[model samples]
Target chain A: PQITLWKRPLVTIRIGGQLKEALLNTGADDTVLEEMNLPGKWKPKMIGGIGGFIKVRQYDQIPVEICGHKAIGTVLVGPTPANIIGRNLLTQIGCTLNF
Target chain B: PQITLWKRPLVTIRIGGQLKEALLNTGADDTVLEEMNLPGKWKPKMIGGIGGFIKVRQYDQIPVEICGHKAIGTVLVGPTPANIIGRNLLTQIGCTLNF
Candidate 1:
């Protein structure tokens, strides 16, 4: 699929048996989702962005389906303005920036 | 050009007679650059991201050469961790997310 950048690159993703829209963020290093519960152990981690830094729970080896493309990677759960699928998951789904 | 998500989609941009590296941020709505001087009248604007909101000076019709692709649009100047080339400019360059 080729998604134009004329608008926010939002895509549907399935995680934890729930469907949600997330942004394909090439600027972000890690995927961060809004507060959500996932089974298994997680560690507290801090990530920085435009404004500042915030703490988040890091869950590894989470299976996420991005626009029907299956990918397994680390997902950070925290207070983010929007769900972001960063390079971590983008790479897994073979997503790329094309011009 | 197709840029793999394994690395940050950073590109060299020529703006205001200066060359700088900027990330191709699909998640960002507007293009934001670190504190810099640009001619013309600018209005104060506020934008939000993963962390929070930040006040910036919005300059309109700014000419920027992104990855050799010319584009003239709004550019925001503020205290940002990195120079970001967002959707405003990405669209002009025909950038897209491909999987």
Candidate 2:
């Protein structure tokens, strides 16, 4: 099976008591944060999504690295379990996934 | 429980085809256009993601990345899945919560 892969950054995020890494995606422009390593910031903001205008009060900018590229800004910090790298940090370095 | 999140443009995509490699992300700046590298220029104007003002896209440019960075002329290319990894590319510095 040929696996198309996109070179990304492997970063470690400190949620509550543990630290974890995320795939760091620059595709999802939604305010929905998705992670599975932190605990305590899980408060779903009834705001909109990638295309909705929902008020997001928990969106914060946290710095991170992928392979080497690093663009600073605020991560949606969704009420999920992990910090899902979003578009807010892709265009900076220039990316390209392989299939 | 508290948690944080973020995503990046792991890379662009070329869905339903065979042209490997996804495109680069740079934040909520929308301009979804995961054509070539897979399905040979998948036609469309806007692909995946929600419907209605997404706040951003791919292809073009925009001023929005991690760590309070800035850019210009953005887009919202939501064609394949590669167009998801965003907002965390060129830099490697942000803040985190201790929860």
Candidate 3:
């Protein structure tokens, strides 16, 4: 790849609540994963944001992997932690925004 | 470099709608580029989300950073976006939701 390795901060999260498949997004603002997809008592809420200010929310303070680094976030359970990423997890490593 | 490179989808967002500078983070969930400091009208509303469903907001459509990657999101404005990340921007990358 002719691209420079821009490193900042990243974390991991699994989506098993409302959606399926495990994915990652460098652009996400929070750690979102599916809780419904997995078995066990799960209580999540909708994070009302933007339009209706609705959000499928939860507290997922778990560990994750990043640019070969280890990090963790609140990891929203309902929205599927691995589903997205957010700010609550970024500014931790002192990442300087470069483009 | 002897490390394996991981690449998911990402976008750039210049923060000015409220803050300043380019910041990179694979941990956040959204691409919130400031809309103020850069010059322009930013009537960013409070995006009601988790808890109080409260959010200090704006739309930042300016490009910022990644690991030297380029992806463009609606660049949310307000609240000095050059500081945090959220779920509003993560799900777009082919992220399988890894944790």
lDDT winner among the candidates? 1
**Candidate 1 total steric clashes:** 0
Q: Candidate 1: lDDT of A24?
A: 91
lDDT of 3 by residue, A17-63 (tens): 22233333334455455444333343556653332423564545455
Scored on chain A only, each candidate's TM-score is 0.97, 0.46, 0.46
Two-chain complex of model 2, DockQ on C-alpha atoms against the true structure: 0.11
Cα error, residue A81 of model 2, in Å, equals 6.3
What are the candidates' C-alpha RMSDs? 0.8, 13.5, 9.7
Query: How do the candidates rank by TM-score, highest first?
Result: 1, 3, 2
Which candidate's DockQ is highest? 1
The TM-scores of all predictions, comma-separated, are 0.98, 0.32, 0.34
Candidates' DockQ values?
A: 0.86, 0.11, 0.13
Instruction: Say which docking band candidate 3 falls in.
Output: incorrect
What DockQ results for candidate 1?
Answer: 0.86
lDDT for each residue of candidate 1 in B1-99, tens digit (9 for 90 to 100): 778889888889999999999999998889999898999999999988667788999999999999889999999999897999999799899989888
Task: List ranges where model 1 is wrong by over 4 Å.
Answer: none
Cα lDDT, model 2, residue A36: 35
Model 3 local distance difference test score: 0.40
Which 10-residue window of candidate 1 chain A scores lowest in summed lDDT? Answer: A46-55
* Per-candidate clashes, comma-separated: 0, 113, 90
